[PDB]
Symmetry: none
Subunit: 73 residues, 5 copies
């Protein structure tokens, strides 16, 4: 499991957000197990969670994610 990232090197990249929520419940990244034997979970990269979620320009630079998730029996 190898990840390699290389980077070699007027409004730009500007965000305005206004949010008005009376009630918010946000769970993000959740793993829940009840009465479970084996649970393997991988979350990788960018997760944005919100009642109001904005992601801008998340990977201008190179980004690498490598995942190997699981079990050997």
């Amino acid at each position: 499991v190898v990840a390699a990232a290389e980077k070699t090197k007027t409004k730009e990249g500007v965000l305005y957000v206004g949010s008005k929520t009376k009630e918010g419940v946000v769970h993000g990244v959740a793993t829940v197990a009840e009465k479970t034997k084996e649970q393997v979970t991988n979350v990788g990269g960018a997760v944005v969670t919100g009642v109001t979620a904005v992601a801008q320009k998340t990977v201008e630079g190179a980004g690498s994610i490598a995942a190997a998730t699981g079990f050997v029996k």
Copy 2:
């Protein structure tokens, strides 16, 4: 499982968001197991979750995701 990303190198990339929610419930990334033996889960890359979700310009730079998810028995 190998990921490689390489990058070699007027309004641009500008977002305006207004959001008004009375009630919000957001779950993001969730794995739930009840009474389960084997659960393997991989989430990779960008997940944006929201009552109002905006993703802009998520990978201008090179992005690589490699996943190998599972089990050998």
Copy 3:
């Protein structure tokens, strides 16, 4: 499972969103198992979820996703 991305190098890329929701429930990426033996799940790339979802210009740069999901018995 190999992913490689290479990048070599007036309003542009501008988004306006207004959203008004009284009630929102959003689930994002979810894996649920009840009483299951084997569940293998891979989510890759960009997922945008929302009562109002906008994705703009998600991969101007090169993007690669490679997935190998499953089991050997």
Copy 4:
């Protein structure tokens, strides 16, 4: 399972969205198993889900998805 993407290098790319929803339920990407033995699932690329979903210019840059999903017994 190999994916390779290469990129070599007045309103352009502009989106306006207004959304007004009283009630929204959105499920994004979901895998549900009840009482199942083997479930293999891969989701790749960009999924936009919403009461109002907009995708603009999703892959101007080259994008590659490769998936190998399944089981060997």
Copy 5:
């Protein structure tokens, strides 16, 4: 399973959407199994789901999806 994409290099690409929904339920990409032995599922490329779904200019750059889905017994 190999995918390769290469890219070598007045209103253009502009979308206006207004949506007004009282009630919305959207399921995105879903795999559901009840009482099933083997279910293999691959979703690739861009899926836009919505009460109001717009996709504009989804692959100006080259895009490749390769999928090999299934089982060997």
